[PDB]
């Protein structure tokens, strides 16, 4: 995030880190329940990757986190790489996440919900702070 | 490595698809929603993450980091996957499996 600010530790409990086996974060994600994570289709997540929950400081390792394995990947069949439309993939965890104050689910809207322009929303992640 | 060790957060406004089309034009489809162009931006490593707005005191997933400027321009709107348009596919996947 360019021009972001450090978040309070544990304040966005559904935020996950998608990493390879070796520990490299490539994309973020969100827990929607204890066995499902939603992320982008362009991320190219596979069953050899890991979902790290309860994470805050990636340079630390005193924080207790959960490294969950993926049992199955559900890429949206109508995803077009040309346009990047329908960019969503569901991750079916093989090992369920244990919820607490630092790990919990985010709500999903209903197909009819409308969020007006000018509405202040929030975005989170561990992406570049400058390019 | 302009990658922050600690989790970042940024507050930004939702754009109307039309105002967003003043930048991206043809690019903007219906399963997409814009936000930003207010001095903040999502950059590489942010993809797949949440764009959440309050709805009755509960944070709700309105978007998923998708794409935007190639250099992460904070004055250009970022494009997210519009969740309300994709939430039925999710319900069917969840229910089915």
């Amino acid at each position: 995030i360019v021009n972001g600010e450090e978040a309070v530790p544990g304040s966005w409990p559904w935020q996950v880190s998608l990493q390879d086996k070796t520990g490299f974060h490539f994309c973020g994600g969100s827990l929607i329940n204890e066995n499902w994570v939603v992320t982008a289709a362009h991320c190219g997540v596979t069953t050899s990757d890991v979902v790290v929950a309860g994470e805050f400081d990636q340079g630390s390792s005193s924080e207790k986190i959960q490294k969950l394995k993926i049992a199955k990947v559900f890429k949206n069949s109508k995803y077009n790489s040309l346009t990047i439309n329908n960019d969503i993939t569901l991750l079916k965890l093989s090992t369920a996440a244990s919820f607490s104050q630092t790990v919990s689910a985010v709500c999903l809207p209903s197909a009819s919900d409308d969020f007006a322009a000018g509405t202040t929303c929030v975005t989170t992640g561990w992406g570049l702070t400058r390019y | 490595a302009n990658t922050p060790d600690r989790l970042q957060q940024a507050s930004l406004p939702l754009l109307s698809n039309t105002n967003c089309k003043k930048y991206w034009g043809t690019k903007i489809k219906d399963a997409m929603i814009c936000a930003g162009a207010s001095g903040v931006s999502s950059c590489m490593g942010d993809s797949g993450g949440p764009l959440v707005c309050k709805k009755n005191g509960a944070w709700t997933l309105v978007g998923i980091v998708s794409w935007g400027s190639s250099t992460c321009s904070t004055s250009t709107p970022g494009v997210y996957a519009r969740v309300t348009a994709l939430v039925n596919w999710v319900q069917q996947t969840l229910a089915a499996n």
């Binding site: 978040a7 309070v8 530790p9 544990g10 304040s11 966005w12 409990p13 929607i32 607490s100 104050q101 630092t102 919990s104 689910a105 985010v106 709500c107 999903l108 929030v122 | 957060q9 507050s11 959440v52 709805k55 005191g57 509960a58 944070w59 709700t60």
Partner: peptide, 10 residues
């Protein structure tokens, strides 16, 4: 869902 136990400071 959507109610963090630790509230965010924005």
């Amino acid at each position: 869902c959507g109610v963090p136990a630790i509230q965010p400071v924005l």
